[PDB]
Scaffold this motif. Structure first.
Motif, PDB file in Angstrom:
ATOM      1  N   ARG A  62      42.397 109.945  18.408  1.00 26.08           N
ATOM      2  CA  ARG A  62      41.305 110.578  19.129  1.00 26.08           C
ATOM      3  C   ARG A  62      40.158 109.642  19.469  1.00 26.08           C
ATOM      4  NH1 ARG A  62      40.273 114.943  14.639  1.00 26.08           N
ATOM      5  NH2 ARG A  62      38.552 115.704  15.934  1.00 26.08           N
ATOM      6  N   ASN A  64      37.763 105.715  19.258  1.00 25.85           N
ATOM      7  CA  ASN A  64      37.613 104.277  19.081  1.00 25.85           C
ATOM      8  C   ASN A  64      36.121 103.949  19.093  1.00 25.85           C
ATOM      9  OD1 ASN A  64      37.326 104.778  21.811  1.00 25.85           O
ATOM     10  ND2 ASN A  64      39.141 103.587  22.416  1.00 25.85           N
ATOM     11  N   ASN A  77      33.623 106.982  21.314  1.00 28.95           N
ATOM     12  CA  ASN A  77      34.299 108.014  22.087  1.00 28.95           C
ATOM     13  C   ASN A  77      35.105 108.895  21.151  1.00 28.95           C
ATOM     14  OD1 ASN A  77      34.409 105.236  23.647  1.00 28.95           O
ATOM     15  ND2 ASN A  77      34.101 106.842  25.172  1.00 28.95           N
TER      16      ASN A  77
HETATM   17  C1  LIG Z   1      39.269 103.854  23.836  1.00 19.97           C
HETATM   18  O1  LIG Z   1      38.267 103.109  24.542  1.00 19.97           O
HETATM   19  C2  LIG Z   1      38.478 103.074  25.957  1.00 19.97           C
HETATM   20  C3  LIG Z   1      37.489 102.086  26.529  1.00 19.97           C
HETATM   21  O2  LIG Z   1      38.157 100.976  27.111  1.00 19.97           O
HETATM   22  C4  LIG Z   1      38.318 104.483  26.506  1.00 19.97           C
HETATM   23  O3  LIG Z   1      38.523 104.472  27.913  1.00 19.97           O
HETATM   24  C5  LIG Z   1      39.339 105.401  25.849  1.00 19.97           C
HETATM   25  O4  LIG Z   1      39.106 106.739  26.272  1.00 19.97           O
HETATM   26  C6  LIG Z   1      39.265 105.326  24.316  1.00 19.97           C
HETATM   27  N1  LIG Z   1      40.378 106.054  23.722  1.00 19.97           N
HETATM   28  C7  LIG Z   1      40.293 107.271  23.164  1.00 19.97           C
HETATM   29  C8  LIG Z   1      38.934 107.913  23.148  1.00 19.97           C
HETATM   30  O5  LIG Z   1      41.275 107.827  22.689  1.00 19.97           O
END
Ligand SMILES: *[C@@H]1O[C@H](CO)[C@@H](O)[C@H](O)[C@H]1NC(C)=O
Ligand SMILES: *[C@@H]1O[C@H](CO)[C@@H](O[C@@H]2O[C@H](CO)[C@@H](O[C@@H]3O[C@H](CO)[C@@H](O)[C@H](O)[C@@H]3O)[C@H](O)[C@H]2NC(C)=O)[C@H](O)[C@H]1NC(C)=O
Ligand SMILES: *[C@@H]1O[C@H](CO)[C@@H](O[C@@H]2O[C@H](CO)[C@@H](O)[C@H](O)[C@H]2NC(C)=O)[C@H](O)[C@H]1NC(C)=O
Ligand SMILES: *[C@@H]1O[C@H](CO)[C@@H](O)[C@H](O)[C@H]1NC(C)=O
Ligand SMILES: *[C@@H]1O[C@H](CO)[C@@H](O)[C@H](O)[C@H]1NC(C)=O
Lengths: 537, 122, 132, 122
Positions: A62, A64, A77
């Protein structure tokens, strides 16, 4: 404590989110550990995702976390939100049991399900909206009422023949494109926060009390986060639409007890606490303008609102924008004198600091007029342009260099008192301000008036100094548009006075201005000035 | 009568005391010192003249004096006194007395926060 | 807990103060002073590795914490003069009890590389020692 | 760097110290031991290989090492140190140190002295 982010964050289930936290860009703070943790009850403040590679079991797939060192920011995020994720959280740096954190509140609301028999409209606070209501082919000669269930009373305060409420006065109409077909409409101008709720529309009645719903949502604006530090400057960008380009716009600051306090108006207002250090610019074709505030103190932090009205005050039913400001106060901007004193006939010299790795720029020097709005006419630049009436008494010098440049203004008068700004062409600008006060006394250096010259013979001019300047260096100049550099023609004969000047044939190339000065190697000091004409016989 | 400065106290040498009288109308005054009940001889202390002070109409005068004592006599608990004679005093003399425990605090809280509770903030 | 007087990071000691305009007897009021000591239980005496065992005795002199010896600037008549601010700063030389987040602390260790030895340099606090 | 176990100290013959490194991204690493401030020869300890640990996100590695020393030197008060060199460290090496008083201490002695708490802080 130097850490800043969004205080409250709202979303619904299934949606994503993006949170940003700010920190001072020092090299310890870029390489240290960043974390996102959930401050629950029962002691601990358990970490959910970290910067070193830790992701928890609940956040797998979910989330990062990305560190941007040049911004001094880091982003989190979180996808696929639920209702168990409502609680109090924390950004941070380093070890959790210390306090280099910031509190964030997150609430997630339940979405829509199996009640979708309405046509909703969303609208900004202080704009227009329509509520369409299908008129049919028999119900014309009844009342076209519109209730709003205050409690569960049907509260008819709108009728489509003028039977209106004194509450909703002055902004409700109807316009005819019906008479047989399936629409009429009502435009609602200048909505408030008070005018929310569910509307039970009708258009005539066939007596079953048959009902039509058309609900609206009015939302208050989201503030933008600005991160500045002590002794720096900020700009706001107020970007309302072109519909209000002939209205007087303003900018308040929110206080505790629901009280904006006007910082600037368009009809000529100002607080006393912002004298000398605020600008307001003329608006473009889109009706968008900017407000600059320099010399940020500690108490400047808070919410700001820009709006529009006929008088220049926060009235309800006006479109607004928002901001939230944080003053860092762990700054790296060097301290400077704020006031510089001088006497009539003497000189001043003020040091203006910029950023060291932006040294390849062009430098400027203002004079804050402050008469109508706030305005910086230039007086001198680093290109080699000086103003008209500042001829022979102004120059800009790139010494001492490496963090600082220097500007010298002599031949002072009592009307030279004012606030002055120093500008560069760099990426992010500090704008520093200094006040020049004029006090009583007489100058240290002493020169005569303006000298003549006979048709081609030797001139000689003296220049005195006391014994407080005996430890220092002495020089002269000849002033031109690119500053001045010293002369080889001087004697500096007497041990405690009389640094002279010799011009052993008066050409036409000497008819200008000359200076007499004092410097400690790199740092500059006092200055006098004289003119030398050449007459006819 | 003023207590010594703390900086002088934290050095284990002689400590200094100050007497002050102000607001009296003729410029005639006497200052004496005491230790316990014994009057010290007047070659052990320095006292200035009696000058007038800037004020609002009614002219008045002021005078100071000092006396340096040993830190063991101060720290044991021996007291000292400054004594002032004037003609407008009804009993013609005044005393003040000073020692330790003059500006001693009234409340002291000590908290020993153990481990497993370290929760400080920036 | 309102105004900071001392924030020392060689000994990790902090002193604040506040005038508490108390409720009863409303024409007199108290002066409160707060002191906070954080004691490290695993540091050495000198900050090198094999020095002496862990420090077990910690001494704090408030006459040294409140000290002020850096020169200041004073406008007397129409002038700028430089003055000192203390009577006792005849002289780093102080012993520190904790580290500091904004300073490097390194060491030197000899290791062997087949033939000779070297003078390999070792970071004791790795966050603050990147060259940047 | 971990202290010896409790049941090895009773038999009074030899003890063992453990050095663990954890969570680094390339799999290249070095381990060197010191006694006091002198490097020990390579043939006196045992180092394993770097292997990949179970995943909690990004893939990382780990390595161990042990050193066996005489139980009299542990009770004199000698210090031993472990050095780890890696590509991502700032000055390419870092170290930890341990001795008898630090690690399973069985005793905590601390004495705090505060001199002049009421003392005109300027
Ligand atoms: C991980 O980070 C990237 C940024 O490059 C973002 O676009 C992506 O949504 C993130 N992955 C998730 C929230 O699962
Ligand atoms: C606390 O520990 C530090 C670190 O050991 C001590 O500083 C170091 O002291 C040694 C010996 O005085 C210095 O070594 C010298 O090196 C020079 C070459 O640079 C050489 O000419 C000498 O013969 C000697 O070998 C070392 O430079 C010095 N500084 C460091 C490592 O940065 C410190 O003295 C100790 N302080 C106390 C109060 O115990
Ligand atoms: C500083 O923050 C800005 C946000 O305003 C970053 O800009 C975004 O960066 C991402 C890269 O992860 C891009 O996908 C976006 O298009 C960028 N713009 C916007 C408006 O979101 C910027 O990357 C940060 N600085 C650095 C040096 O990365
Ligand atoms: C510029 O300033 C820095 C910091 O004071 C100094 O290290 C550097 O040498 C300076 N550069 C020059 C050219 O003087
Ligand atoms: C100096 O004297 C000359 C003589 O005519 C005059 O033209 C000039 O304006 C004078 N300048 C000032 C600053 O008085």
């Amino acid at each position: 404590s130097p850490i800043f982010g969004p205080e409250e964050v709202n979303s619904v289930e299934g949606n994503s989110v993006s949170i940003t936290c700010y920190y001072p860009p020092t090299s310890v703070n870029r390489h240290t550990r960043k974390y996102w943790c959930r401050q629950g009850a029962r002691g601990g403040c358990i970490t959910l995702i970290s910067s070193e590679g830790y992701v928890s079991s609940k956040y797998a797939g979910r989330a990062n976390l990305t560190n941007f060192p040049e911004n001094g920011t880091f982003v989190v995020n979180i996808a696929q939100l639920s209702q168990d994720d409502s609680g109090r959280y924390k950004c941070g740096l380093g070890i959790n049991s210390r306090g280099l954190s910031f509190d964030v509140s997150l609430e997630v609301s339940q979405g829509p399900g199996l009640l979708n028999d309405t046509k909703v409209y969303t609208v900004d606070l202080g704009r227009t909206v329509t509520i369409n209501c299908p008129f049919k082919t028999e119900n014309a000669q009844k009342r076209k009422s519109l209730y709003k269930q205050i409690g569960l009373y049907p509260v008819l305060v709108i009728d489509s023949s003028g039977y209106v409420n004194p509450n909703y006065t002055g902004r409700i109409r109807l316009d005819i494109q019906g008479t047989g077909q399936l629409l009429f409409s009502v435009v609602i101008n200048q909505l408030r926060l008070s005018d929310a709720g569910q509307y039970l529309c009708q258009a005539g009645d066939d007596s079953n009390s048959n009902k039509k719903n058309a609900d609206l949502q009015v939302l208050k604006p989201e503030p933008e986060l600005v991160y500045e530090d002590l002794r720096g400057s900020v700009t706001f960008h107020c970007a309302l639409g072109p519909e209000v380009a002939n209205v007087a716009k303003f900018l308040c600051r929110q206080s505790s007890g629901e009280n904006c306090d006007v910082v600037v108006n368009t009809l000529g207002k100002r607080a006393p606490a912002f004298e000398g250090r605020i600008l307001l610019n003329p608006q473009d074709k889109d009706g968008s303008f900017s407000v600059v505030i320099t010399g940020l103190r500690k108490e400047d932090a808070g919410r700001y609102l820009c709006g529009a009205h006929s008088d220049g005050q926060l009235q309800e039913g006006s479109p607004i924008q928002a901001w939230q400001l944080f003053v860092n106060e762990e700054s790296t901007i060097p301290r400077s004198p704020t006031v510089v004193k001088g006497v009539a006939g003497g000189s001043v010299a003020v040091l203006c600091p910029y950023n060291r790795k932006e040294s390849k720029s062009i430098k400027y020097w203002c004079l804050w007029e402050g008469a109508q709005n706030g305005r910086c006419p230039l007086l001198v630049d680093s290109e080699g342009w000086v103003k008209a009436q500042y001829e022979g008494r102004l120059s800009l010098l790139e010494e001492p260099g490496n963090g600082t440049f220097t500007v010298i203004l002599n031949q002072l008068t009592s009307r030279d008192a004012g606030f002055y700004w120093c500008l560069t062409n760099g990426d992010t600008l500090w704008r520093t301000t200094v006040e020049i006060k004029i006090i009583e006394g007489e100058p240290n250096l002493k020169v005569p008036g303006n000298v003549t010259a006979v048709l081609g013979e030797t001139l000689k001019v003296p220049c005195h100094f006391p014994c407080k300047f005996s430890s220092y260096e002495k020089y002269w100049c000849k002033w031109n548009n690119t500053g001045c550099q010293a002369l080889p023609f001087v004697n500096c004969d007497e041990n405690s006075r009389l640094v002279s000047l010799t011009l052993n044939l008066v050409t036409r190339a000497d008819e200008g201005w000359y200076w007499c000065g004092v410097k400690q190697g790199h740092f500059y000091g006092e200055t006098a000035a004289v003119y030398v004409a050449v007459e006819e016989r | 009568l003023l207590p010594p400065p703390s900086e002088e106290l934290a050095l284990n040498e002689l400590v200094t005391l100050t007497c002050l009288a102000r607001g009296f109308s003729p410029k005639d005054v006497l200052v004496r010192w005491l230790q316990g009940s014994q009057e010290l001889p007047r070659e052990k202390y320095l006292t200035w003249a009696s000058r007038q002070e800037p004020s609002q109409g009614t002219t008045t005068y002021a005078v100071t004096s000092i006396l340096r004592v040993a830190a063991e006599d101060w720290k044991k608990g021996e007291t000292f006194s400054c004594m002032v004679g004037h003609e407008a005093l009804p009993l013609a003399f005044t005393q003040k007395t000073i020692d330790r425990l003059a500006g001693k605090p009234t409340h002291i809280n000590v908290s020993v926060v153990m481990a497993e509770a370290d929760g400080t903030c920036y | 807990e309102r105004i900071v007087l001392v924030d020392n990071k060689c000994k990790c000691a902090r002193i604040t103060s506040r005038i508490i305009r108390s409720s009863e007897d409303p024409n007199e009021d108290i002066v409160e002073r707060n002191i906070r000591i954080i004691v490290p239980l695993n540091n050495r005496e000198n900050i090198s590795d094999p020095t002496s065992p862990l420090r077990t005795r910690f001494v704090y002199h408030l006459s040294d914490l409140c000290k002020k010896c850096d020169p200041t600037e004073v406008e007397l008549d129409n002038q700028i003069v430089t003055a000192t601010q203390s009577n006792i700063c005849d002289e780093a030389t102080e012993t520190c009890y904790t580290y500091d987040r904004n300073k490097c602390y390194t060491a030197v260790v000899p290791l062997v590389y087949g033939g000779e030895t070297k003078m390999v340099e070792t970071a004791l606090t790795p966050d603050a020692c990147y060259p940047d």
